[PDB]
Design a binder for this molecule. Structure first.
Ligand SMILES: [Mg+2]
Ligand SMILES: [Mg+2]
Ligand SMILES: [Mg+2]
Ligand SMILES: [Mg+2]
Ligand SMILES: [Mg+2]
Ligand SMILES: [Mg+2]
Ligand SMILES: [Mg+2]
Ligand SMILES: [Mg+2]
Ligand SMILES: [Mg+2]
Ligand SMILES: [Mg+2]
Ligand SMILES: [Mg+2]
Ligand SMILES: [Mg+2]
Ligand SMILES: [Mg+2]
Ligand SMILES: [Mg+2]
Ligand SMILES: [Mg+2]
Ligand SMILES: [Mg+2]
Ligand SMILES: [Mg+2]
Ligand SMILES: [Mg+2]
Ligand SMILES: [Mg+2]
Ligand SMILES: [Mg+2]
Ligand SMILES: [Mg+2]
Ligand SMILES: [Mg+2]
Ligand SMILES: [Mg+2]
Ligand SMILES: [Mg+2]
Lengths: 65, 87, 270, 104, 129, 70
RNA sequence: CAAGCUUGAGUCUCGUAGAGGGGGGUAGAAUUCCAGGUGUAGCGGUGAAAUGCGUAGAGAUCUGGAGGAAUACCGGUGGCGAAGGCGGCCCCCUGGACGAAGACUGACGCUCAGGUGCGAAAGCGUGGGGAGCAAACAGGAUUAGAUACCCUGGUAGUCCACGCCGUAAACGAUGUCGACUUGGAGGUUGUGCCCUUGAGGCGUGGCUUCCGGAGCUAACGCGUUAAGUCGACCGCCUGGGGA
């Protein structure tokens, strides 16, 4: 019941945050693929367009800061 | 090796400007790769997992020249005297 | 940087340090003067620091530990074997004919265009004072009072690393592992010093001492007891705590009392 | 002529030097015959962690095509300059010219 | 890669024979037609074809009696590593008289029960039991 | 988990939502995992024989629901 | 020997996915240590204990700082490499594999004794670094003794640039290349279609995991990725000890 393959995207640009504020949990970790149901090609592009934003200071690393 | 740097060797050595499959073309397209790749192994001498491609290219060019040496000995001497290959 | 081949006892252990970048010729003429071998004896004509005397004729080469000329660029010309210090010395031609000697950084050759002064761009070879250098970049020729001359970090292969730029002071870390405060406007030079493998050189034999001007050294428990505390014994005996010639302990006892400089020593070398 | 997606973060006290930075970093590319595709300011943005002990920084996105030399220069200005706090330069394989997702 | 086509033909026969197929194929040749021109005339296979103008596919057709298989055992006796050349003084009979051995004489490929009375010997291409 | 209580939330409720919101993010598995050292051989053996026994008890559902007993 | 063709083997066009190798940066959480501030009697430890650390102020708790090693979530019998093996992000140089439509060259192929390369950890040399762990070693215990598993500390070593060593259950305990022979569940990754018209149905390619039939095997088990039916070539064993 995926989202990316459904909507027909080809790249997950990290510079959108209104999407990635669904695919991170409360603490700031990444919710696994057998829970969001994302296909396992776009899960890798998700796990890199989160780790770019965590560097570029749009998404936290933990809950505290 | 870039596209317009192989489409120069195809036109230099290729008898149709389309053929891309001749034996002299398939030796020149490896020698103008090895002699360009020698200036990458002068900086990174520990790169064995991309030295295996170089040993592959060398020992396949040796086979594609020893085919030519017994097929047509006329072409083989002028091919090595054009490329500089000693043997 | 090769071992010499064992033809005969005397070259069995030699590791040279050879370098083909150097100048195989004569030094620059208006930069020499006389540095005669003082022989370890002062005006009173007595041996004060021992072991010294002998060797080869060491003609001094003048060298610019100040680098005062701001603004003007400076091409390098060649390198030479200055036999005073254990570094190598570059010969520099400025844009208006003035030649000088400077210390040689690690990435130096014939073709570099260095530039001294306040507004120098950041590249190894350049110099600029330490309120425009960025933090972390390792420097040599660090001065302790602004304008005196290059004093800190001036050997064969040393460096000091700027770690903090607070107030109107900077904090270094010297090569002997001791932190140090320096006035924030002393004239430092970026990058290390070139000839980094002098410590690999094993000299090989006795003769490479007395071609460098070091005499023999007689250890303490050889002598008879009017010349050193360690003497005596009808055979071998060393039944006393290890001392200098002149009474003082040597195996650990600290001897620093220069109490006018302790504003700047942040932590001792451990 | 490989394209590039650069982004840098300047300090909000020095937030009045960004037209200087934009019209001085168009120089080293467009005078270096690399075309300039899209170029946006993002204003001041709340961070979500401390970086150099502050909380609001200033983002500029610059998506530009260049020869491989001048971009290999353009990181040194960001490093030895201390106006900018962070900079990321990615190698986009093609030439994007859409509006940024956070212009809305 | 391929270092023999005859022990490719025979093993396609036997592996389409014990797997209860009906029509094995292969790429053709000029020896694997003079072998399935002996197997048919003996009677081990019903009828063969050949299809194509530039690269031909030989299409055999296997046979069955009572639901079981016809070519029960089929060895291969002169193989490319080791060539067996026998003279007609010492030609072998396979299974005492019921199984043939496709001998290549000089007078065309023929079974040994005819190529012992045509008065010559030759290579022994395959036993068939 | 940072459980900020709401307006008039009773205390066992605003404590049990914390204990659930800590069990979910799972810090009591992680700080048990980093307690000792599991080598790259022992961890791989464990996370292979902890997948073959997810396979077998994903499967054996749909075979042992074919043979009745009464 | 001589002459040819396109299915073996190869090159060119456009792309796709990947912890493949080598070099230089940088980001965050934590362990330790140093300087302090608040603070008062215990902390640490095991099955219970003591050794050790604290009334010279530990342990907690807050700000600040130096440095080193490793990359939580993603992370899955998932991916890449010929094996050894390889996990944060970013940039340079570079090796393969695979699909797609074509054009081309005309067996250029397969295996390989002696050779020559790569080859985890441990070791070894010369020069740097050392936060965590940690053989030897020192102390407290359990014990009939305990040179041991448990505990408090801790040096080689782990790490980095360059040289040797060339061994492991280097394991799929299965040498490499090719052709055939019933099926079904998946996973990962390309692509031409058909009302694609949100997760649809019709296909053909490569790579990897379980269960299972003929046939084989002493059995267990293997099972189109064979240990089935074959062809080419190389390695290797011949009772246990001695070894
Ligand atoms: Mg002396
Ligand atoms: Mg001595
Ligand atoms: Mg002596
Ligand atoms: Mg005496
Ligand atoms: Mg005395
Ligand atoms: Mg005596
Ligand atoms: Mg005595
Ligand atoms: Mg053709
Ligand atoms: Mg052709
Ligand atoms: Mg051998
Ligand atoms: Mg090692
Ligand atoms: Mg070592
Ligand atoms: Mg060491
Ligand atoms: Mg330590
Ligand atoms: Mg212990
Ligand atoms: Mg040792
Ligand atoms: Mg062995
Ligand atoms: Mg292994
Ligand atoms: Mg294994
Ligand atoms: Mg073995
Ligand atoms: Mg057998
Ligand atoms: Mg099976
Ligand atoms: Mg087999
Ligand atoms: Mg067997």
């Amino acid at each position: 019941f995926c989202r990316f393959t459904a909507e027909g995207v080809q790249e997950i640009d990290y510079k959108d945050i209104a999407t990635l504020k669904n695919y991170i949990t409360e603490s700031g970790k990444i919710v696994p693929s057998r829970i969001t149901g994302t296909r396992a090609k776009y899960q890798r592009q998700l796990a890199r367009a989160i780790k770019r934003a965590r560097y570029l200071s749009l998404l936290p690393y933990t809950d505290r800061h | 090796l870039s596209t317009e740097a192989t489409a120069k060797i195809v036109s230099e050595f290729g008898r149709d400007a389309n053929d891309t499959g001749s034996t002299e073309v398939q030796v020149a397209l490896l020698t103008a790769q090895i002699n360009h790749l020698q200036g990458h192994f002068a900086e990174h001498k520990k790169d064995h997992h991309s030295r295996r491609g170089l040993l592959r290219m060398v020992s396949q060019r040796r086979k594609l020249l020893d085919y030519l040496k017994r097929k047509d000995v006329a072409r083989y001497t002028q091919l090595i005297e054009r490329l500089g290959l000693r043997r | 940087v090769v071992k010499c081949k064992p033809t005969s006892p005397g070259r069995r252990h030699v590791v040279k340090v050879v370098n083909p970048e150097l100048h195989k010729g004569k030094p620059f003429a208006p930069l020499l003067e006389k540095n005669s071998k003082s022989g370890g004896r002062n005006n009173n004509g007595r041996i004060t620091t021992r072991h010294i005397g002998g060797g080869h004729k060491q003609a001094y080469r003048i060298v610019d530990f100040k680098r005062n000329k701001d603004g003007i660029p400076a091409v390098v010309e060649r390198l030479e074997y200055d036999p005073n210090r254990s570094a190598n010395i570059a010969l520099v031609l400025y844009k208006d004919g003035e030649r000088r000697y400077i210390l040689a950084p690690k990435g130096l050759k014939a073709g570099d265009q260095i530039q001294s002064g306040v507004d120098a761009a950041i590249k190894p070879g350049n110099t600029l004072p330490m309120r425009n250098i960025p933090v972390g970049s390792t420097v040599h020729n660090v001065e302790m009072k602004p304008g005196k001359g290059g004093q800190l970090a001036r050997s064969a292969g040393t460096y000091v690393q700027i770690v903090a730029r607070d107030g109107a002071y900077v904090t270094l870390r010297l090569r002997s592992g001791e932190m140090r405060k320096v006035e924030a406007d002393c004239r430092a030079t970026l990058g290390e010093v070139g000839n980094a493998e002098h410590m690999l050189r094993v000299l090989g034999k006795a003769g490479a001492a007395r071609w460098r001007g070091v005499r023999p050294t007689v250890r303490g428990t050889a002598m008879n007891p009017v010349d050193h505390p360690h003497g005596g014994g009808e055979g071998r005996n060393f039944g006393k705590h290890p001392v200098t010639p002149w009474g003082v302990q040597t195996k650990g006892k600290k001897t620093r009392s220069n109490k006018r400089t302790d504003k700047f020593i942040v932590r001792r070398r451990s | 002529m490989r394209h590039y997606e650069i982004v840098f973060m300047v300090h909000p006290d020095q937030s009045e030097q960004v037209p200087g930075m934009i019209e001085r970093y168009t120089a080293a590319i467009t005078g270096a015959e690399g075309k300039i595709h899209r170029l946006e300011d993002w204003g001041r943005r709340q961070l979500a962690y401390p970086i150099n002990k502050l909380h609001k920084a200033h983002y500029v996105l610059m998506n530009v095509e260049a020869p491989q030399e001048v971009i290999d220069e353009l990181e040194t200005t960001f490093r030895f300059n201390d106006a900018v706090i962070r900079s990321m330069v990615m190698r986009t394989k093609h030439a994007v010219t859409e509006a940024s997702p956070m212009v809305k | 890669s391929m270092q023999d086509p005859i022990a490719d033909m025979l093993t396609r026969i036997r592996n389409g024979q014990a797997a209860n197929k009906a029509a094995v194929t292969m790429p053709s040749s000029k020896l694997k037609v003079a072998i399935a021109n002996v197997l048919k005339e003996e009677g081990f296979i019903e009828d063969f074809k050949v299809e194509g103008d530039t690269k031909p596919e030989l299409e055999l057709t296997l046979k069955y009696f009572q639901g079981k298989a016809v070519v029960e055992s089929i060895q291969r006796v002169s193989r490319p590593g080791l060539r067996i050349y026998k003279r007609k003084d010492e030609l072998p009979k396979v299974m005492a008289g019921l199984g043939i051995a496709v001998v290549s004489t000089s007078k065309g490929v023929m079974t040994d029960r005819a190529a012992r009375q045509a008065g010559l010997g030759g290579e022994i291409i395959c036993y068939v039991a | 988990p940072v459980i900020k209580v709401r307006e008039n939330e009773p205390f066992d409720v605003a404590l049990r939502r914390f204990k659930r919101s800590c069990e979910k993010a799972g810090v009591l598995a992680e700080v048990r995992r980093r307690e000792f050292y599991e080598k790259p051989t022992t961890e791989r053996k464990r996370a292979k024989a902890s997948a073959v026994k997810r396979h077998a008890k994903k499967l054996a559902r749909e075979n042992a629901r074919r043979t009745r007993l009464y």
